[PDB]
């Protein structure tokens, strides 16, 4: 099984800055390599495939490069939207395998365009639903014990 | 009678492939084989002029075109190969303008598969086969 290995495991960077994640495979994967981005509590999204080809609807500040065993994703000018975990996947050999991910967060006059404010409601409702199902699973045994 | 050739595609990118050429007499050249690591869709497939691999696929030079030109086409212009969702193209082509001997020989020249439908993703010099 191919072990794809990312670094750093997390990192912080300021807006406008230039960022470079790396992904290193335990074998030559001949550029059969895809980069995925995943913001918190959202589904993964395809950034790059075959090592260097941008997907549809991907900002051009994202770029990918490398070959052989060593590859890198580079965000040229980091916007605030780009805080996420990034994953590399290789599909050269089966099974497909994935990096452990690089978490990317910001470091220490915005536009009115309220998007950050609206993002909070789904996040909170999601966290509450976790708690509900958590306590539903705690009831489950007790209710089984009551029936015997 | 029967001339055979073969070509191993290689590039910086994910593209790989072996191309086979067979030609009986001065009948057509049957091109065949498989290319992997392509994006789904159509990819330009041309015999370029030189079998010069010193500078990757750039050193292959332009399309093989001795007649300085479909009827109006380069000799090397074999159109498109088609890759599926598996990233693979099965090559199956018959052509009369190219040849494995004489003035229109491709022996000692380069096959190139391209990024888009007709950059150079992979190439290889065309050698004499068993």
């Amino acid at each position: 099984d191919i072990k794809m290995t990312q670094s750093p495991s997390s990192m912080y960077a300021s807006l406008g800055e230039r960022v470079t994640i790396t992904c290193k495979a335990s074998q030559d994967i001949k550029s059969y390599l895809s980069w995925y981005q995943q913001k918190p509590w959202k589904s993964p999204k395809t950034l790059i495939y075959y090592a260097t080809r941008l997907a549809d609807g991907v900002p051009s500040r994202f770029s990918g490069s490398g070959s052989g065993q060593d590859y890198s994703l580079t965000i040229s000018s980091l916007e605030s939207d780009d805080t996420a975990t990034y994953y590399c996947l290789q599909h050269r050999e089966r099974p497909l395998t994935v990096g452990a991910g690089t978490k990317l967060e910001l470091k220490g006059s915005w536009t009115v365009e309220q998007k950050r404010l609206l993002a909070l409601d789904p996040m909170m409702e999601q966290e509450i639903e976790e708690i509900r199902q958590k306590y539903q699973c705690k009831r489950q045994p007790i209710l089984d014990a009551i029936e015997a | 009678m029967e001339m055979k050739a073969v070509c191993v595609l290689k590039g910086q990118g994910p593209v790989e492939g072996t191309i086979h050429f067979v030609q009986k007499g001065s009948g057509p050249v049957v091109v065949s084989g498989t290319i992997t690591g392509l994006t789904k869709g159509e990819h330009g497939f041309h015999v370029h002029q030189f079998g010069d691999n010193t500078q990757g696929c750039t050193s292959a030079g332009p399309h093989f075109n001795p007649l300085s030109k479909d009827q109006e086409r380069h000799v090397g212009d074999l159109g498109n190969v088609t890759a599926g969702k598996d990233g693979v193209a099965i090559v199956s082509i018959e052509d009369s303008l190219i040849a494995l001997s004489g003035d229109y020989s491709i022996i000692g020249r380069t096959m190139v598969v391209h990024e888009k439908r007709d950059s150079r993703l992979a190439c290889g010099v065309i050698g004499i086969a068993q």
Epitope: S34, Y36, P44, T46, Y50, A55 | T39, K85, D86, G87
Partner: nanobody
Framework: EVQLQQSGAELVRPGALVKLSCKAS????????MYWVKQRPEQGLEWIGW????????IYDPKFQGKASISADTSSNTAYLQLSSLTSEDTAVYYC??????????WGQGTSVTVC
Amino acid sequence: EVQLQQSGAELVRPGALVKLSCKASGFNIKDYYMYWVKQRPEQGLEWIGWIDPENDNTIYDPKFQGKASISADTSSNTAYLQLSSLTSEDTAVYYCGGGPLYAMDYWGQGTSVTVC
């Protein structure tokens, strides 16, 4: 406009079977592969397997040999993942996606499964 609708959140007893679904609209799943991806809480993505709906050929990660069974109904344009013998190990978010062998063009919103 493409969309992958996945089934809703499940919550089941140990040993339970569950069958997740992925309804594609905007593309014929026959022209793609339908993938499944697991993501345990506070962990990364694991690829489970894919199916080629055109011939029902399925590749799996051997890790999921036993647990996971992928299927597609080309008529209803829907892909399925079935997890059996569920344990706490299986509590995760399962994403379905569709794409060529070299990329996922489309991702589902994901179905959370919780096992008590």
